[model samples]
Target: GRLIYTAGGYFRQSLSYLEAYNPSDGTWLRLADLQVPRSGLAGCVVGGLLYAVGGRNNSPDGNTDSSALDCYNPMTNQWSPCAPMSVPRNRIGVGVIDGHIYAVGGSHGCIHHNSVERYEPERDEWHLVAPMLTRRIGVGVAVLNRLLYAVGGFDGTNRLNSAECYYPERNEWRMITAMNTIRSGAGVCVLHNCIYAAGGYDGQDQLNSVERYDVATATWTFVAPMKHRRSALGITVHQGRIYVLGGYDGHTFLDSVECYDPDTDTWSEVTRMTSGRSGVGVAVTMEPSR
Candidate 1:
């Protein structure tokens, strides 16, 4: 079974969940909502727990921030607050490795950041880690074969194609292959040992292109294009396919959803989301059998 969840934004600060699409029946079902509403947050699942990190609230004037960490246990259908981060960030990237969750680059107000921190759930504490080489906001982070890969995002003045890798054993950072194009607010995930980077803004235009980075060669190659150009989208792999949920296209907010099958190098349109939103967070939930 596959599960999908998205954090809400704007006047819509509600967390929404969707059942992974079933090709035979094409439908979705809702799950429990998040305790707090936030945008530009980062999320990851470890064991049976889903952890949501810092983000901004939808203030009336649109400028309130938070550093609160929220943890949800779907088994109990309940949420509890966790230790906060050192900085209040939105558009951050997060990933878990060896039971430790790493919180990476993001922004506070208009400032992009290069800081990295690690969260220890058992101790309820956050420890600073080596920062990235470049300051970025709205970057994407994913783990493949125990290595954490941080993908495309933006510096304060421009979008970026540069990427980096973190070695937990060594506690060090190393630069990897750059993306084909400079972009920000893209979605990233690792599947079958490859990192997939999808739709985002190129500073001047929203994009529909997708690219994959081959870890073995440290090279990037183009994949099939997405159906729509977007930014701040949420992406995840479920049932052997990649699902792209809600995002913005500069001119309008989107509720459209689509999935990619790497085997065929193709894409298929899926059921739309309940609402249009961007800067959302997504996580894949695995349930234990009763």
Candidate 2:
């Protein structure tokens, strides 16, 4: 009952491509290629479209880093451009709420940023939102119960385990309970009211550790870890399941896939790709009503 769309990131070379995964049949299909070939970009679903925002185009440099906004419509199998952001950046933390794409902190090569921007598809425009307290890249983001969360990431100094949540009504972000373990480049998604942060690198090692945030109590609890320790991977939540796709595991890149179900509180391994994948993104959602 969901279609997760994830795209773009570097591996072997940079990728401007993405895939659509169906949990119902455990089958995957290739979707449209991104208009701009990019890596380290952020993606989120809004109005049933996948928006790829602010990323580096294969190479790392101010000129190569882009402020471009490329959107894909799965139902139509096409791509289009939206209004660009004010600044060029990559490695963003992205989320969606109330029909807007919230593109969060991403650095420009060596410089880290805290600025946040939101894109309104209805108006085809981008607007600045309240900045996050942490300025880092490779963070995982998710929208749970209408609240936007910017979780763990690298903040130039060290890998962070800190977490923060945003309230659009107040236009403010407040610090929340930190995760049990420090991490960056993790995958974040929501099953219901809880936000799950899974599989990330903790600077010293690639981590298989996992944590979940309970919005009602505003606390983070340790959970069953993934089968593979990974980072810079992507995850999507569909029907009540969370699927984590390819990422790096310290030794080499991985093409393995897995999903977690709350009912069983277990992580089940799925089919693996031949060529390893790293620095990619993933998403999932129910097919929108026509």
Candidate 3:
């Protein structure tokens, strides 16, 4: 019923699409591929179009490079270029709110960044927004009720548990509650009015822990842990469920997918992706049913 888009990593660094599972019956359908291969990109859906943000291409020497923003339309099965970001970055955090796309913290050329930029589709331009409180790369970002939340990420030296929220109306960012554990390169999604941060590395160890932030109380509470400890995974909310996609474990990359249900406080294994990947982007294809 819903379509999911992902940016592949490693040897298979191409964009791929698959259907979001139906609880009654499980199936998958292939969509379009990206023009260029990349990984560690950020993704969000805006105005019914899926935008794949900055990422890096693998060089022959094993070095990575940044890419410009690219947009995909599922309805037409096509890709279009958008206005490029002022600063090129990879492993970034992104979110959409009030008809604008916010590209948050990431690293460029070994430098961790704290700058925040907003892109307006109507004007095809970018504007600098309030800078983040901390410089982080490989962070997770989500927007709920016009407020954008940035979660666990690494700041070059170490992984962090710090979190912050941005109010678009006020054009300001405020410190929020921090997660119980430190993590970076995690997957994040907002469901049922709560922001869920899942699966990442805490410097030395990979983690499967899940945490939820309560907006009303401005606090973070731990939730049921995930089945696998992953970093650089893709997360999205579809059909009232949170889907965690491909990432790597300690030894190898993964194609496995999992789903979480807040009502039962449980996680269930689902259909795995066609390819193994990490540092990919994800977004729902269709508009919400009213």
Candidate 4:
């Protein structure tokens, strides 16, 4: 029932480094390496295991997007390969509902896509699903109650302020009210029955603005922003609080952490990470029953 951040840029080379943060102690512990060192990956939880999906693989001179799916078992502390995506993808937004995980809109390296797919752990396979309404990279995907959401991100050529949600029962996606600010790489999660979107890079600069969507009214409103501007960061809810972790802020890769308190409409500092990281994938994993 705690979270871990795995695989991002570390040192001069891109890495497979994994780190776990403790909410009680406010500290990080270096864990095992990913099977393949990559970044811009999306992660989700299903059946108690943390699954790291497609990302960009680094190599001499240039880096390439990957379709490889690497899975981690904390109980065994081991890494294993799973079925890869049908196409190479990076900058993915992932979400899980019921028992299936959906890999939403992301680029297939050269082109951004509206295509989406879902993974069924019971079948242990991936398949094409109804695509998102728009092509999105750097978006946030979350299952809020009955509907699945796709939040702000870069749409290939522009920073998007638009938002949309997928109705699984209908197999359709439709636009919702747009955000007040355009952003990409923003961190998003649903808490207190409201969906919160936090700091990200707008087209022109890094943003510290925050906003939330109310499922009750299907409306958007501003919330207190985080203390630091974050892009490509890790976000997760732990014990009823939203934690924003390592990301870039234009000039520097940041190790700073912050949390937004909706009740008070304010933010407070949390301890920083061991090293600054960008494109890190965060997941809250509970112990496997098996």
Candidate 5:
């Protein structure tokens, strides 16, 4: 069966926790912990390995920024370190294209970052790329048509509605039409030739409103709002529907889950996580064959 894995979150400022949700049985199975405890990290699977990227550990001792890149092998059920990012990034966004991964805007403590980097797995090294036009933290990133699209986030002072896309071939970024609403920590993913930006903080309230951008027309329009408001939620396209996991819902952390069906243009509640998780990293991987 296919599995959605969520790791490292702000349950305790940061956690080493790792767990996999089996959609077939609607159950979560505990997995190996991350080598480093972190929150606001980016999760992705490349070449059958799960990677946890830059984040921060807000411990009493001090604010320890993590640039550590760690990989998990399902075959052995263990984690190992890889080449780290040059700069620490918390609330970072990641997207994979052409077998390579791009790490986008995030923050280091209070300093917002516009800098971007690309990881070459073969070389196990990170090279700096053109930075985003505006510094952002809690940015939402998704890849469509081989171009990396970076959506809303906070730029230190205000929540943002701006958007931009990176042309990998030209090594440049072009501004795109802004979103309908300002969003920070929104769940972003591409499906059915459209880019969806779901719940996030709007500088005033946690949002339940959802919107989609049409690649062909370069326009965005409202969609069905979610059942629950989510900030820093874990969202991904599993099988076909969009599944949104744990997140902060303004008053409390949410363990509730929901799925959006494009065919019907509706959202239905699904199985919840064992507990709440905010700022969690979500990714999918097929079960390894023995």
Candidate 6:
């Protein structure tokens, strides 16, 4: 069985919030709080442990330590300090390739960054990798066919429609077909060998548009849109479907959760989160102790 985990976000809420949803019973369980509260962080799992990294803490600059990293062990139900990144990052994106967690683009203080890093768990260190072609914040990331995809995001000046993927074999990021509509803070994930980009802020409005990218042809096409407009939502694959969690609409923060079925090309609501959250971090774990 698999469980969905989410933590940290923006809203009228605690900065260190963490919770897990067991889809089998449709129940949510509150777990340990993040040692360092944050917003705009990214979450990923490696070796059965959940890692939360690179988000702003409650500070004037909204920046935590440049290298802040937290690891959650289900066996202990606790978050412990770990090696940090070399650069400060908020609204960052992350993906696991070859057992190494890759931290992608985001911002630090006034500068939005195009830098990338890979976390070596065994060594407890982060090593620099090839940066993206364009600086990005609120970028959405996912792994498809062993390639790490960095989707549309804000580049400090404007919302972006361009997308790129990194090839670890060559240690280079190559441009891919861009999305039809510009998006930042979008929820991105992979299902059935296709990458799905959904719901994000486009500088004008919170968006409900969704696009599907086919790896074989390197093409992107429109898909069924979500019922609600959202940006900075937590998204992941669960039970062979894409699950989107809380995010901010233009007018309000949202607690609603929904899932998309590729077979039907349709989306339906699921149980809501306990509270509204935007910029939330999400990951799925198959660890039995959890």
Report clashes for each candidate as comma-separated counts: 0, 5, 0, 0, 0, 2
Candidate achieving the largest lDDT: 5
For 1-290, candidate 5 gives per-residue lDDT tens digits of 67888888887568788888887888788888887778888898899888998888866566787788898888888899889998999999999999888999999878899989999888899999999998989999999989999999999998999999999999998999999999999999888879999999998999999999999999999999999998999888888888888789888888888999999999999888887878888888876444
lDDT of 1 by residue, 119-161 (tens): 9988999999888888878899989888888888988887899
Candidate 5 residue spans exceeding 4 A from truth: 288-290
For each candidate in the order shown, give its overall lDDT on alpha carbons.
0.80, 0.80, 0.81, 0.80, 0.89, 0.88
TM-score to true structure, per model: 0.92, 0.92, 0.92, 0.94, 0.97, 0.95
Predicted structure 5: lDDT:
0.89
Q: Candidate 3 on 85-107: residue-level lDDT in tens?
A: 88877888899988899999888
Candidate 1 deviant stretches above 4 angstroms: 11-28, 287-290
**What TM-score does model 5 achieve against the real structure?**
0.97
lDDT of 2 by residue, 1-290 (tens): 66766687677667767776665676666667887777777777776677778878774432477788887776778788888987887777788888888888888868788888888888988889898898968888888878899999989989999999899999999999999889898988887778899988898998887888997787889888899999988777766788887888877778788889888889998766434676665665445334
Cα RMSDs, all models: 2.4, 2.5, 2.8, 2.1, 1.2, 1.7
The collision pairs in model 6 are: 67-84, 67-85
Per-residue accuracy of model 6 over 25-74 as CA lDDT, tens digit each: 98888888998778889888999898998888755544453357789988
lDDT of 4 by residue, 54-125 (tens): 778775678788777777887877778888888877878888889888887778766897888888877779
List ranges where model 6 is wrong by over 4 Å: 59-66, 287-290
Model 1 clash number: 0
Error of 3 at 97 (Å): 0.5
Score residue 11 of candidate 6 by CA lDDT: 80
